[PDB]
Design a protein around this ligand. Structure first.
Ligand code: CLA
Ligand code: CLA
Ligand code: CLA
Ligand code: CLA
Ligand code: CLA
Ligand code: CLA
Ligand code: CLA
Ligand SMILES: CCCCCCCCCCCCCCCC(=O)OC[C@H](COP(=O)(O)OC[C@@H](O)CO)OC(=O)CCCCCCCCCCCCCCC
Ligand SMILES: CC(/C=C/C=C(C)/C=C/[C@@]12O[C@]1(C)C[C@@H](O)CC2(C)C)=C\C=C\C=C(C)\C=C\C=C(C)\C=C\[C@@]12O[C@]1(C)C[C@@H](O)CC2(C)C
Ligand SMILES: CC(/C=C/C=C(C)/C=C/[C@@]12O[C@]1(C)C[C@@H](O)CC2(C)C)=C\C=C\C=C(C)\C=C\C=C(C)\C=C\[C@@]12O[C@]1(C)C[C@@H](O)CC2(C)C
Ligand SMILES: CC1=C(C/C=C(\C)CCC[C@H](C)CCC[C@H](C)CCCC(C)C)C(=O)c2ccccc2C1=O
Ligand code: SF4
Lengths: 169, 739, 168, 80, 41, 160
């Protein structure tokens, strides 16, 4: 028996072999009954959204926009003060982005049905970082780790605002 | 390698949990139509068709009994836990006559918190009609901590019974010879179970319930009453209430049992403080029952040259009119589980009905006679359980006749001779049923039409043509004269229902002489007629379960089959199951009439309030005597009149009873769709629905089929019973809680 | 035959010699109908939990964390900690650890090779070869059993008599 | 008496004949199927209409069909 | 835990779990926002 | 206004209903003692009743002559939160349920044992299909266009 590298008292999970964040961490075996490509796509998207949202917290409490609506240093209270109209526009824009970036196939059964789709690979690289394949793997691992850390931190900041109410500081 | 058990017969594995229908040879292949799903649950406990060995069936039955007892223990633990945590039992103890027992609080969601009634004692919740508070008080339970510990013990016992079932199916399963030791089983169930349970309960009553309840009746608050264990360690806390414990057990071993007359009395009647039976009388009763049952347990020969053989007893009881007599009955009852189930279920339902009668007749718990909702609910529930169990006993007798009956082994015995003249039995029972129905009901209809025609002197009433139940009144007179004449050591009659004084607790009547007039004559004959018709249906099912003049090979079609075909003019419902279906309907009718008679008679001529000068005013006002003799009277002065509380319960804490009233009406009417219709129409409608699904590519792989004819009948009867019983349940509960 | 612990009782027939802390003590034959690895894991879990619990009870009756909520005796600390939510955090993280334990014990029972109670947690070494590991396993088992009995006595005495650290 | 008809979809599996409770059906030689036999109904005066015959028919929509008609003491199953 | 998980995948257990979850979130929506006769927006 | 109804904010009978309910609840509250849980529960009932009546008053709700909110479901967007928005919400949810059920039926209908996978659900595949129902309006008007939504003549028909 091999046993996992992360959880040393557990057997090595299956389906994670050719990935860019494999430390053998899957005690519940989510990769066995869920497609690993979909799981990586979801992890990357959740991580990127969490990173953007954490940066949004830190900037919102600091900078903010001119106007009476955009005057709440607290993100949770800003979600309510801003009203539904600005939020629904963000929702529709995110939907438009989702549709055009995945080119129609948006669901768990439709995406990766034909393969030829690296999980999380939207081809988005205008600044050109990533031409060298040597640093590409390191960049992918850094993105994954930062995304996970940002998921934890996004939960932390949101719940700090809920239990205190003032801000993050 | 024990001689009674087999070790590790079945492996404890989850593999068969993932293969539904593995028990059945036909269902194991997997579902092809939706009929497979229904067949899966209809054959789950039919262990006879799952194995060909009586040993395996017996082991499955034994483990199923353990599972059932674990379920019962879990239910009891839940009841005690609710009494401990979500009840006003402590408040009810200090004010039994003014606080309504409640042991279930309702969460505040969707406005349902209105169900939390003003039960009293600074409590909000649902009023409890199961009488647990009175039972706990009779047990001497004076604190909610004791209820919590009883709940914990119930949980432990439930786990123990689950473990016992698992152990005796998978680790050590008893052999067939162990199960067939009916002599040993009877000896143990009679001495150990019954007698030693009575003895242990008598000990508990004498040492815990007798002193604690005596202190409670004396006015001592539950907080200053000593803890129950102190009544055992200290022979002076109990010797003050009953000054006979000072002599210890010496009077018992010296045969001077007269010294124990302090706490082993024979009084009769009711406790004037609580309205229940004297707990000293109860303890003496349980002691006598224990001795009698222990003695009765030393009857059958088990392992020594001592006792009786049931085979030799039965085989010696022949006669000129009965041929071989009881020869072969021992083989029938030791090789067929269905025959044992028939006898046990019939006698068990009859026992439940007898219990229901003796409950209200002689209230055995403190402050339970003045809790009218508890009395009504207990009587109705126990009578319903008795009727259901009796129908089940008839059903399993029919099942035994179809499946486990061997013609060769029963040559010219009682079973054979009964089948040989089944025609005579059924024809005479038919004549008796027609006679009883004609008379009882047509006397009711004659009263109704005489009243409708303005001829009040032509009725079958007390102020008219009178049918006095003289035989029952003679018995009532004999019982009220028994103390001092035939029961010379009695101080009071067994029940005040036979006659005597009005017993009131807190201005509320506990018991009172139940007068019998022409109204009781008619309703008693209605009871006899309904019981006779139910017996007719069930006995026709049992006797004609194997063959008939219509179908000479009905036994080859099994116990459960819809018909033999449209031929012979139509052979619907010829099974024996279709007789347990019709008998279920008629049992519902009979029990409904019985509980209606009880409710109206008690409310009109027993229950009520007593004025300080001794004037008795009842709940309804004595309208039973003159208005229960016509069907219009039953419709108006009982159904319409006492349904006022149910229909006016909206917005109050009894609104749940009105909602259940309406829902039970809905379910009862829903049943008639299955009872009146047939399978072909529903199959052909499912055909068009399946066409639509196929048109939308959503037709299931498991082909949807209409419920089988037998399952359609079963669904119809189940819904009918549920709707009717629920309607009566809501009506009774709302009416008797409001007033 | 003739188990070491109870010399007049037969050997439990499931504990020959190949378990740490195996003196053949199973009079009521719990090992005759339950997996040995399952019972070993349960015993080791109880040992560790009760060792931590005894140390915490004794220490918290001496040293208190800053704050008014932490100014109660260990006997009355349960109702205070549950109200403050202190025990909720322990419950959450213990539940996470116990779900991972569900996975681990399932894998151990269905093959794998993980010894009962072996989570491979060993930042320091303290056990370099087989002999040291066996000796330290025996020490852990004996200390855990002693601490289970000690916590039992501590709680029973403290509940009987509401005394401080000397629960006599 | 009821009417019983046999159709050439008969596969000669004999399940109808051995299910008749009143000896109405019988197997007769034929050349339209592998078994070389076809069911016949020469004693329909004893037909009771129980339709056990077509409950045992394996062919798609039956090869034996029972049409209920005039009633008789034999067809009504009257022992009296 | 290979056949136990298959047992939990049966129709009755899955339907019971799904209906329990469904009733749960319905009841909790009605607890946190009770007496909702019209759409909140 | 619409249909002769009037806003509940100006309906006297509505306020009479509120006052009567509050009075009944307070009378019930009078028979308990101090800050005991029954009094807390009755006070919560009173607070919830007042909040519900206030919300119904300030909700563009039309009340009849009985002082009860009447629903205007003719289709006008003015009273669109009474029927139209809940209608859209239910249509979305029910279309989701139907779509995931149909997709699961068609997916396990092409396996070796289609009937087995209906009593013993393939929970991985079931979860995969169920979370994909958020696009059911788009998936339906992408399968109907391709002719994959409707069968044509392989469907069975009775004799006539
Ligand atoms: C077998 C009989 C039985 C029955 C009919 C009930 C019925 C009930 N119990 Mg209960 N209970 C029982 C046994 C039983 N219990 C036992 C044996 C115990 C001891 C462990 C308890 C301990 C218990 C507690 C501690 C509570 C209840 C509560 C409740 C009520 C709400 C249940 C609920 O929503 O759970 C939903 C369950 C699920 C969704 C799980 C699936 C309900 C009337 C609750 C109550 O009345 O709240 C006021 C409550 O707080 N029960
Ligand atoms: C004095 C001895 C004794 C006692 C008390 C019982 C008691 C019981 N037997 Mg039993 N039995 C006995 C001897 C005894 N049996 C013998 C010698 C045989 C062999 C012929 C059987 C064969 C037998 C069968 C085949 C069945 C029973 C069943 C039952 C139960 C009937 C259900 C009931 O009334 O609920 C009353 C319930 C209670 C009062 C709850 C408390 C009872 C607990 C469990 C004590 C049980 C005593 C037990 C025999 C002690 C053995 C302990 C074990 C470690 C050896 C009841 C618990 C039936 C049953 O329900 O199966 C489980 C059943 O199907 N018995
Ligand atoms: C000690 C009691 C007892 C026992 C051990 C049995 C045991 C048995 N009976 Mg039996 N029976 C009993 C009492 C009993 N019965 C009673 C009291 C009646 C009269 C109604 C019957 C009537 C009866 C018939 C008519 C038949 C049996 C059959 C059987 C056998 C198969 C049972 C099965 O698979 O059902 C599995 C269990 C179910 C299908 C459960 C069905 C659910 C019920 C009907 C509804 C319960 C609703 C419940 C009250 C909650 C409603 C509340 C609502 C708000 C939701 C089995 C040997 C059958 C057989 O073939 O025997 C060989 C058969 O045809 N019995
Ligand atoms: C109100 C409806 C109703 C009525 C009146 C009856 C009546 C009867 N049922 Mg029942 N039954 C009912 C509903 C009813 N049933 C339902 C819903 C079911 C479904 C489960 C059944 C299922 C059922 C079964 C399975 C059986 C019966 C049997 C009986 C008969 C018992 C013998 C008897 O009393 O005959 C006497 C007749 C009456 C009491 C009816 C009223 C007669 C009046 C009062 C006296 C005579 C009037 C006079 C002749 C009128 C002449 C004037 C006229 C010509 C103008 C009786 C005919 C049993 C049977 O066959 O009989 C033994 C039987 O086995 N029934
Ligand atoms: C079974 C384990 C256990 C449990 C349930 C508790 C529970 C409690 N302790 Mg406690 N404690 C423990 C072990 C335990 N302790 C140990 C081993 C020590 C010695 C360091 C202490 C020292 C201690 C002090 C000094 C105080 C408490 C206090 C308290 C109470 C509230 C605050 C709190 O949770 O402690 C906070 C706990 C600490 C600050 C130290 C805990 C150190 C841990 C147990 C050692 C490392 C283990 C590791 C983290 C395990 C990982 C778990 C895994 C699932 C990830 C609460 C009743 C406080 C109180 O109210 O007293 C009445 C208080 O003042 N404890
Ligand atoms: C399965 C569906 C479901 C969902 C989505 C929730 C969701 C929630 N529950 Mg919950 N709950 C459920 C079923 C559910 N519950 C059931 C079946 C019970 C037992 C009857 C509870 C008992 C329960 C309690 C006791 C509490 C929650 C609380 C909560 C909230 C925080 C966690 C959250 C809104 C907490 C909350 O928000 O209260 C402040 C809380 O204290 N729930
Ligand atoms: C089938 C017809 C029907 C309809 C249209 C309604 C509609 C309604 N009922 Mg109702 N009800 C019905 C049948 C019906 N019921 C039946 C048969 C009963 C008897 C059991 C009840 C018993 C009942 C009670 C006891 C209560 C309601 C309430 C309500 C209202 C609040 C709904 C709610 O919780 O929304 C909120 C929840 C949702 C919208 C769930 C969907 C949310 C999902 C997760 C969104 C996710 C996707 C984005 C709503 C107007 C409540 C009320 O306030 O009445 C005004 C209330 O207290 N009903
Ligand atoms: C009641 C009549 C009675 O039980 O007498 C008892 C009578 C005597 O029968 P035996 O002497 O043959 O019974 C001896 C043994 O069978 C003991 O059961 O039994 C019958 O003849 C049955 C006829 C019932 C006729 C119903 C009227
Ligand atoms: C921090 C955390 C996890 C941190 C892990 C980190 C950062 C490391 C992550 C990584 O290394 C991995 C793993 C793998 C790498 O490939 C990726 C990176 C990213 C490198 C979880 C916190 C988890 C935090 C949790 C669970 C907090 C729960 C708090 C609760 C429940 C509070 C409740 C109360 O506040 C209320 C509600 C009311 C009050 O009155 C009472 C109380 C009780 C106090
Ligand atoms: C609990 C949690 C993470 C827990 C992580 C744990 C335990 C990790 C443990 C480990 O790492 C360690 C410790 C060590 C590792 O080696 C092993 C593991 C085991 C992996 C994240 C919560 C994460 C929680 C998150 C992200 C919640 C975000 C909430 C948002 C955005 C809410 C928005 C709103 O609330 C507003 C603002 C207004 C409302 O009215 C409307 C809405 C819209 C609802
Ligand atoms: C409607 C009907 C059907 C069709 C009924 C069917 C197909 C039953 C469908 C049951 C569904 C599929 C499952 C049950 C759904 C309920 C909502 C669950 C019960 C409610 C719980 C609270 C118990 C018959 O097959 C039938 C057969 C013979 C005589 C009469 C009838 C008959 O009336
Ligand atoms: S279907 Fe109904 S009617 Fe036709 S035979 Fe069977 S039972 Fe008699």
């Amino acid at each position: 028996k091999v046993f996992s590298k992360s959880v040393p008292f557990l057997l090595k999970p299956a389906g994670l072999d050719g990935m860019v964040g494999d430390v053998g961490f899957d005690p519940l075996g989510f990769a066995t009954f869920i497609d690993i490509r979909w799981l990586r796509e979801a992890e990357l998207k959740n991580g990127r959204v969490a990173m953007l949202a954490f940066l949004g917290f830190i900037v919102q409490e600091f900078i903010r926009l001119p106007g009476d609506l955009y005057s709440e240093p607290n993100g949770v209270k800003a979600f309510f003060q801003v009203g539904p109209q600005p939020l629904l526009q963000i929702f529709l824009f995110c939907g438009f982005l989702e549709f055009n970036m995945h080119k129609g196939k948006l669901t768990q059964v439709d995406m990766f049905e034909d393969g030829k789709r690296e999980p999380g690979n939207f081809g988005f690289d205008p600044l050109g970082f990533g031409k060298d394949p040597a640093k590409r793997e390191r960049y992918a691992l850094a993105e994954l780790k930062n995304g996970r850390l940002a998921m934890i931190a996004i939960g932390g900041l949101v719940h700090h605002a809920l239990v205190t109410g003032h801000a993050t500081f | 390698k024990s001689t009674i058990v087999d070790f590790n017969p079945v492996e404890t594995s989850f593999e068969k949990w993932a293969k539904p229908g593995q028990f059945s040879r036909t269902l194991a292949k997997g579902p092809k139509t939706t009929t497979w799903i229904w067949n899966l649950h209809a054959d789950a406990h039919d262990f006879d068709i799952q194995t060909n060995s009586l040993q395996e069936v017996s082991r499955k039955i034994f483990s199923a009994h353990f599972g059932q007892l674990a379920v019962i223990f879990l239910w009891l633990s839940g009841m005690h836990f609710h009494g401990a945590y979500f009840s006003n039992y402590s408040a009810w103890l200090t004010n039994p006559t003014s606080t309504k027992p409640s042991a279930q609080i309702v969460w505040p969601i969707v406005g349902q918190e209105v169900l939390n009634a003003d039960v009293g004692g600074n409590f909000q919740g649902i009023q409890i009609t199961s009488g647990f508070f009175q039972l706990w008080r009779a047990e001497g339970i004076t604190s909610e901590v004791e209820l919590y510990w009883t709940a914990v013990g119930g949980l432990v016992a439930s786990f123990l019974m689950l473990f016992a079932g698992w152990f005796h199916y998978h680790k050590a399963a008893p052999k067939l010879e162990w199960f067939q030791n009916v002599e040993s089983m009877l000896n143990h169930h009679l001495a150990g179970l019954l007698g030693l349970g009575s003895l242990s309960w008598a000990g508990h009553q004498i040492h815990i319930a007798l002193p604690i309840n005596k202190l409670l009746d004396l006015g001592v608050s539950p907080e200053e009453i000593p803890l129950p264990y102190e009544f055992i360690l200290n022979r002076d806390l109990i010797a003050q209430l009953y000054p006979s414990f000072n002599k210890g057990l010496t009077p018992f071993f010296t045969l001077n049992w007269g010294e124990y007359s302090d706490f082993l009395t024979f009084k009769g009647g009711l406790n004037p403080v609580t309205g229940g039976l004297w707990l000293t009388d109860t303890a003496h009763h349980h002691l006598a029952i224990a001795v009698l049952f222990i003695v009765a347990g030393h009857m059958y020969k088990t392992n020594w040259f001592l006792g009786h053989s049931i085979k030799t007893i039965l085989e010696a009881h022949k006669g000129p009119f009965t041929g071989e007599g009881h020869k072969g009955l021992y083989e029938v009852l030791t090789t067929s589980w269905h025959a044992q189930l028939a006898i046990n279920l019939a006698l068990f339902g009859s026992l439940s009905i007898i219990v229901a009668h003796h409950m209200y007749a002689m209230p055995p718990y403190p402050y339970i006679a003045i809790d009218y909702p508890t009395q009504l609910s207990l009587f109705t529930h126990h009578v319903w359980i008795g009727g259901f169990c009796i129908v089940g006993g008839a059903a399993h007798g029919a099942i035994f006749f179809v499946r486990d009956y061997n013609a060769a082994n029963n040559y010219n015995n009682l079973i054979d001779r009964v089948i040989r003249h089944r025609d005579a039995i059924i024809s005479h029972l038919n004549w008796v049923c027609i006679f009883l129905g004609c008379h009882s009901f047509g006397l009711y209809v004659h009263n109704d039409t005489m009243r409708a025609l303005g001829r009040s002197q032509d009725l079958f009433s007390d102020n008219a043509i009178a049918l006095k139940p003289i035989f029952a009144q003679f018995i009532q007179n004999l019982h009220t004269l028994a103390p001092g004449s035939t029961a010379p050591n009695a101080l009071t009659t067994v029940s005040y229902a036979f006659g005597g004084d009005v017993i009131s607790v807190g201005s509320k009547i506990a018991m009172m002489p139940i007068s019998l007039g022409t109204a009781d004559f008619l309703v008693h004959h209605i009871h006899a007629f309904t019981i006779h018709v139910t017996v007719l249906i069930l006995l026709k099912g049992v006797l004609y379960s194997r063959n008939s003049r219509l179908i000479p090979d009905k036994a080859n079609l099994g116990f459960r089959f819809p018909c033999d075909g449209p031929g012979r003019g139509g052979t619907c419902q010829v099974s024996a199951w279709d007789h347990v279906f019709l008998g279920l309907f008629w049992m519902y009718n009979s029990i409904s009439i019985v509980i209606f008679h009880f409710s109206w008679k008690m409310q009109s001529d027993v229950w009520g309030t007593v004025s300080p000068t001794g004037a008795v005013s009842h709940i309804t006002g004595g309208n039973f005597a003159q208005s229960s003799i016509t069907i219009n009277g039953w419709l108006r002065d009982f159904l319409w009149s006492q349904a006022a509380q149910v229909v006016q319960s909206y917005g109050s804490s009894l609104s749940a009873y009105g909602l259940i009233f309406l829902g039970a009406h809905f379910i009862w009417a829903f049943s008639l769709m299955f009872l009146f219709s047939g399978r072909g129409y529903w199959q052909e409608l499912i055909e068009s629905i399946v066409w639509a699904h196929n048109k939308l590519k959503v037709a299931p792989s498991i082909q949807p089929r209409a419920l089988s004819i037998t399952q359609g009948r079963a669904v119809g009867v189940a819904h009918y019973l549920l709707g009717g019983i629920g309607t009566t349940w809501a009506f009774f509960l709302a009416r008797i809680i409001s007033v | 035959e003739k188990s070491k612990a109870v010399p007049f009782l037969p050997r439990p027939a499931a504990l020959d010699g190949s378990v740490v802390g195996d003196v053949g003590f199973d009079p009521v034959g719990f090992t005759s109908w339950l997996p040995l690895s399952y019972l070993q894991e349960a015993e080791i879990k109880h040992c560790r939990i009760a060792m931590l619990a005894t140390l915490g009870w004794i220490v918290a009756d001496f040293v208190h964390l800053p704050g008014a909520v932490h100014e109660v005796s260990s006997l009355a600390a349960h109702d205070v900690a549950v109200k403050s939510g202190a025990l909720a955090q322990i419950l959450i993280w213990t539940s996470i650890a116990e779900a991972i334990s569900v996975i681990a014990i399932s894998q151990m029972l269905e093959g794998s090779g993980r010894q009962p109670g072996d989570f491979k947690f060993d930042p320091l070494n303290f056990a370099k070869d087989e002999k040291s590991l066996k000796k330290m396993q025996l020490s852990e088992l004996k200390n855990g059993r002693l601490a289970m009995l000690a916590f039992s006595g501590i709680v029973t005495q403290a509940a009987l008599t509401g005394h401080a650290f000397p629960y006599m | 008496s009821h009417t019983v008809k046999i159709y050439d979809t008969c596969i000669g599996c004999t399940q109808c004949v051995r299910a008749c409770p009143t000896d109405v059906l019988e197997m007769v030689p034929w050349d339209g199927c592998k078994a070389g036999q076809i069911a016949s109904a020469p004693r329909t005066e004893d037909c009771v209409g129980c339709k056990r015959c077509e409950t045992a028919c394996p062919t798609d929509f039956l090869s034996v069909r029972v049409y209920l008609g005039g009633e008789t003491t034999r067809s009504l199953g009257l022992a009296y | 835990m290979k056949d136990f998980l298959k047992y939990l995948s049966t129709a009755p257990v899955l339907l019971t779990a799904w209906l329990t979850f469904t009733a749960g979130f319905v009841i909790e929506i009605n607890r946190f926002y009770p007496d909702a006769l019209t759409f909140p927006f | 206004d619409i249909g002769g109804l009037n806003p509940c904010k100006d309906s006297e009978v509505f306020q009479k209903r509120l006052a009567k309910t509050v009075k009944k609840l307070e009378n019930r509250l009078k028979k308990y003692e101090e800050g005991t849980p029954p009094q807390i529960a009755i006070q919560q009932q009173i607070t919830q009743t007042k909040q519900r009546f206030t919300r119904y008053a300030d909700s563009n709700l039309l009340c009849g002559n009985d002082g009860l909110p009447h629903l205007i479901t003719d289709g006008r967007w003015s009273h669109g939160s009474e029927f139209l928005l809940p209608s859209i919400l239910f249509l979305y949810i029910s279309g989701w349920i139907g779509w995931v059920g149909r997709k699961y039926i068609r997916t396990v209908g092409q396996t070796s044992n289609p009937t087995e996978k209906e009593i013993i659900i393939d929970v991985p595949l079931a979860i995969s299909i169920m979370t994909s129902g958020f696009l059911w309006p788009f998936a339906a008007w992408q399968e109907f266009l391709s002719g994959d939504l409707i069968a044509s003549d392989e469907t069975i028909t009775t004799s006539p």
